[PDB]
Design a binder for this molecule. Structure first.
Ligand SMILES: CC(C)(C)c1ccc(/C=C\C(=O)Nc2ccc3c(c2)OCCO3)cc1
Ligand code: NA
Lengths: 537, 119, 86
């Protein structure tokens, strides 16, 4: 029943009455009570909010500092901080869950977060409360990463403590300061691809449903880690892939251009050098295509991209997959006696040459341009194409209804009329392309209406809209490019898992402080120098 | 006043026209390669040359494109689809892309053009 | 060696301790000491910032009005203002 999971304790907390809760627990009220009720479940489509089964989870979710303090410091039955809730979440996991993008929410779920870390350390100095994972198997960092709590993420990633005793559970270790000049280290415990899910991996592969996904990367340690790796060991590899892809596309273009024209496929193997070069090019192209197909399948399986919106987060992958599909079908038809393979080959060639834009993410400026092109091929061009297609189809139907051809004679075809109005769109529309009509006024009025509505009205309408788009989303294109580079580098570093791993590591192992157990801290830090002329303390 | 105009012309010949020209060259080269692969000329006939096809697509971008400049192909549907894709990607999309980008430029950097003229 | 160019005077300035620096120079500590160390060089690609070899250059680079005032007004060895650094 619904009224069995709850107790007087959680409600007494809900009123935020410290006296009431302490009196209730004075007699020895249980603290392990779990609110396993559907009203408290995480489902956002139903009333209520999840705050954790343990009442301490509720209080931490609330701003009741006194309640958490007393419950953790009570002489009898101090509820264990390290508790897996029904969904496997700890009070920290619940905290990050409750966190939002709201500033006051950020303040609450940051101050309370640090406080509870300190307190749990005090009760259990040697307890890895920030490492426990839920049923989904995410640490609180991994939770804020997979959810996108930019405030909690930043708080964890820049976490600093001045108390010498408890500074161990601290993220940023300031080293020294000689004038404004002062270095800054970090931890990178799981930032690097050295764990089951690395927050960089979590951000990179997270679908677009998660908000602020591209915006979180701006946290200085992560962004600098990205730039460092990119300039250190990936940029060269990325340029190498660019160059090999160029060689691939040039070989494919040369082979296609010299495709034999005489006789259905397949062909034969002349003794001349030209034939051998042609077959070498063709087979190299086939190999490239099959590799691209396999890679597309691998991305599909590994990521299993959000099927709801797969065109907004994997555009390039779909393009490569489609080009590979065209090449493969060219291969199947080629041997299948049929000169229709050329169609698939040509589509593949166009697709690949146009896909060369995918590599433009390695360059700051051209990358923004490619991002704009994708964004407005999926944002503005589709809408305008729909409306223009309605206009053109209606006016073509009207005109063809008007034409008779009862006698530049076979224009009755609807395809011809559509083509002629399209020429009107591209500035080659002959206002008197046909004289088999029977009402000049009607024909001319229809053509003029079409010209006014599409050529002078719509096309300029699209120009206006696209101006609005760019004006709004310049910065958005920048950020999306940044995210594209992040995915690029993550994929690259993943590619050399078997090639080697030792040199593909960022940061330096260091030992600065000590843990309360009187031992050393072997942590992979990463310095950051900063120049501040005002702090002076 | 004319000085600001010259400064604009310089800045956007070294800022935007280069990038747009790179991307447009990629598109035109790819689609020209596709089309020339499609043409056969096995009988207005020597379209084969890649230079001729590049020229026809360039005419397309300057408002003198002939959607039926050649009838020697073997899949009219493929040829028409390629030409229409080129027109949509370049003429209606990329040129208007450039117009939008340059609007953004001028809006930002009017004052920059002024100061560079002063310099 | 790195730890020869520096002296207790420049560090005493670095902490911004007027009492410490004036006491240190009370015994007659040298003021012409030059911090000819790579850490203090102008290179922006390396850690550290250049503030001038003469300690007065450091203090003026800092906002230490008191230090510049005192050293320029000290009874013994007012560091010469006109000094070409390295
Ligand atoms: C192959 C054919 C000729 C049928 C064809 C294929 C695609 C298009 C349209 C677009 C296209 O292919 N657009 C694109 C593809 C890859 C990119 C990119 C943009 O910008 C971002 C990086 O990679 C037109 C004709
Ligand atoms: Na025109």
């Amino acid at each position: 029943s619904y009224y069995k999971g709850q107790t007087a304790l959680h409600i007494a907390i809900e009123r935020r009455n410290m006296t009431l809760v302490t009196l209730l627990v004075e007699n020895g009220a249980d603290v392990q009570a779990a609110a396993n009720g559907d009203f408290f479940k995480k489902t956002k489509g139903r009333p209520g909010f999840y705050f954790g089964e343990l009442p301490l989870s509720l209080a931490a979710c609330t701003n009741q500092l006194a309640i958490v303090k007393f419950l953790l410091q009570n002489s009898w039955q101090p509820a264990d901080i390290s508790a897996r809730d029904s969904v496997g979440n700890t009070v920290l996991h619940a905290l990050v869950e409750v966190a939002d993008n709201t500033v006051d929410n950020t303040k609450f779920v940051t101050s309370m977060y640090n406080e509870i870390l300190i307190l749990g350390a005090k009760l259990h100095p040697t307890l890895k409360l920030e490492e426990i994972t839920n049923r989904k198997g995410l640490t609180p960092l991994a939770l804020a990463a997979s959810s996108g709590k930019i405030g909690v993420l930043a708080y964890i990633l820049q976490r600093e403590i001045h108390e010498p005793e408890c500074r161990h559970l601290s993220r940023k270790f300031t080293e020294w300061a000689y004038g404004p000049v002062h270095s800054s280290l970090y931890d990178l415990s799981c930032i690097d691809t050295c764990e089951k899910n690395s927050v960089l991996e979590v951000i990179a592969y997270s679908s677009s449903e998660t908000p602020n996904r591209h915006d979180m990367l701006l946290v200085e340690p992560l962004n600098r880690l990205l730039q460092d790796k990119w300039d250190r060991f990936v940029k060269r590899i990325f340029y190498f892939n660019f160059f090999v892809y160029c060689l691939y596309m040039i070989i494919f273009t040369a082979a296609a251009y010299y495709r034999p024209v005489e006789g259905l496929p397949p062909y034969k193997l002349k003794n001349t050098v030209g034939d051998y070069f042609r077959v070498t090019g063709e087979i190299l192209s086939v190999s490239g295509g099959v590799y691209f197909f396999f890679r597309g399948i691998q991305y599909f399986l590994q990521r299993r991209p959000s099927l709801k919106s797969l065109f907004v987060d994997s555009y390039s992958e779909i393009l490569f997959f489609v080009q590979s599909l065209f090449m493969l079908v060219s291969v199947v038809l080629y041997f299948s006696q049929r000169k229709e393979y050329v169609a698939s080959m040509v589509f593949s060639l166009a697709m690949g040459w146009t896909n060369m834009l995918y590599y433009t993410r390695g360059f700051q400026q051209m990358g923004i341009y490619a991002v704009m092109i994708e964004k407005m091929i999926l944002r503005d061009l589709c809408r305008f194409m729909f409306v223009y297609l309605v206009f053109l189809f209606g006016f073509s139907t009207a005109v063809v209804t008007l034409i008779e051809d009862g006698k530049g004679n076979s224009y009755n075809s609807l395809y011809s009329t559509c083509l002629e109005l399209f020429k009107f769109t591209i500035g080659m529309g002959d206002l008197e392309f046909t004289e088999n009509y029977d009402f000049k006024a009607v024909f001319i009025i229809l053509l003029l209406a079409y010209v006014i509505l599409t050529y002078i009205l719509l096309l300029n309408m699209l120009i206006a809209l696209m101006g609005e788009t760019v004006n709004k989303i310049a910065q958005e294109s920048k950020n999306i490019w940044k995210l594209q580079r992040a995915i690029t580098i993550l994929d690259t570093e993943k590619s050399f898992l078997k090639c080697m791993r030792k040199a593909f590591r960022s940061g330096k192992l260091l030992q600065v402080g000590f843990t309360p157990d009187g031992k050393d801290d072997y942590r992979w830090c990463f310095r950051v120098d900063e120049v501040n002329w005002t702090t002076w303390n």
